Amino acid sequence: VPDPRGIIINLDEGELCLNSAQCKSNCCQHDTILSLSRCALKARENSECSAFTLYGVYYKCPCERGLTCEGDKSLVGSITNTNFGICHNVGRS
């Protein structure tokens, strides 16, 4: 009996997900506070990205391989959870 098989993951983007660690592209995308979440792709250069990640669903997914999330301010009259950085090519050498 080779150890307990609890790691049942690997789902493509465009399908209904609970957390972000279930899809192949680790990005369960939140439909703005309502919580009906569907998987998506990671962010590209000059797009909004979440600089920290939890064990769960994301409002703006993190940056691609070699690019950083630039999370310095982004609070132009803040009431909801709308505070995000921009993807740029700093995390390489």
UniProtKB/Swiss-Prot annotation:
Disulfide bonds: C17-C28, C23-C39, C27-C61, C49-C69, C63-C87
Key word Signal present: yes
Subcellular location: Secreted
GO process terms (BP): digestion; lipid catabolic process; response to bacterium; response to food; retinoid metabolic process
Gene Ontology CC entries for this record: extracellular region
Keywords in alphabetical order: Digestion, Disulfide bond, Lipid degradation, Lipid metabolism, Secreted, Signal
Tissue-specificity statement: Expressed by the pancreas.
GO molecular function: enzyme activator activity; lipase binding
Propeptide, chain numbering: 1-5
Keyword Secreted: yes
Major site of localization recorded for this protein: secreted
Family: Belongs to the colipase family.
Subunit structure: Forms a 1:1 stoichiometric complex with pancreatic lipase.
Role, per record: Colipase is a cofactor of pancreatic lipase. It allows the lipase to anchor itself to the lipid-water interface. Without colipase the enzyme is washed off by bile salts, which have an inhibitory effect on the lipase.
Record's protein name: Colipase
Source species: Sus scrofa
Taxonomic path: Eukaryota, Metazoa, Chordata, Craniata, Vertebrata
Gene field: CLPS
